[PDB]
Amino acid sequence: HMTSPFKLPDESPSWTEWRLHNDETNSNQDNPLGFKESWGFGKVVFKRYLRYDRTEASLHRVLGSWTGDSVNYAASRFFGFDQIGCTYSIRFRGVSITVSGGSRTLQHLCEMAIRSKQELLQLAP
Amino acid sequence: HMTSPFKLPDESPSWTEWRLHNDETNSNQDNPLGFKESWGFGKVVFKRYLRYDRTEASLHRVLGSWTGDSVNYAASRFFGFDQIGCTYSIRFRGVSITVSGGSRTLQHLCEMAIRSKQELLQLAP
RNA sequence: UUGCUGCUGCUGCUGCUGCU
RNA sequence: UUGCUGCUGCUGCUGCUGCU
């Protein structure tokens, strides 16, 4: 058991739900069920698939999936004298963004990760 | 010879200039000579080190180092039926951002790359 | 484009090394 | 933190493969 940086649980679709969504949507790279994101600290990675429908209500919900404080609490379990690498990644509609650097830069990594997340999820389709 | 996506030439400092800058600046991860960025198309990568001093004039100059059109002109030299991977990376003050995906998403990659570049270069120190 | 296995080729990050 | 060499460990992207 490990404390996760995420504050919402994973919502990965089953294979059947994915196949049903594929049968009832025209392009499904344009209209996925949601997006995937992950936070890596040294060799430990935590991942989420979150549903997102491009409304303001849904954007607000998924932007609450991690904060600077929840990331710092989870990441500090792995910190010591030497710096470790930290990475946030998010993929949505065929585009991935990663924000990465050493643990001494974690506050800045979170600031850039949250802004990347918001821009990507709001990208004109 | 290859057509580059960049519209400004490389400004990598020499080793001596870097050592002189290191002797006259207090922290040099806080106050680097500039930032590094690269555009990768399949296995071909183009890189720049650009000087940047955190003023509006300098931000405006370095945001002119590539556009959607200069990236598309350079990247289309490598396109064909199958998609290739495309990646933009930028590192500044210890934080790297990469934006990546397949060549069919290149317009969106540029849109997200330019926004990432601007946020990172404007990040509060 | 759900999740995962094996292969490939590139990148990015951390640490280390030897120049510059 | 200039640029580069060799090592390491993770990630991300493209393509391919076999489930789900």
Curated annotation (Swiss-Prot), chains A, B:
Keyword annotations from UniProtKB, A to Z: Host-virus interaction, Inhibition of host innate immune response by virus, RNA-binding, Suppressor of RNA silencing, Viral immunoevasion
GO molecular-function term, one example from the UniProt record: RNA binding
GO cellular component terms, A-Z: virion component
Keyword Phosphoprotein carried by entry: no
Record-level GO BP terms: symbiont-mediated suppression of host innate immune response
Similarity remark: Belongs to the tombusvirus protein p19 family.
Summary of subunit composition and partner proteins: Homodimer.
Function: Viral suppressor of RNA silencing which binds specifically to silencing RNAs (siRNAs). Acts as a molecular caliper to specifically select siRNAs based on the length of the duplex region of the RNA.
Protein name according to UniProt: RNA silencing suppressor p19
Organism of this sequence: Tomato bushy stunt virus (strain Ja9) (TBSV)
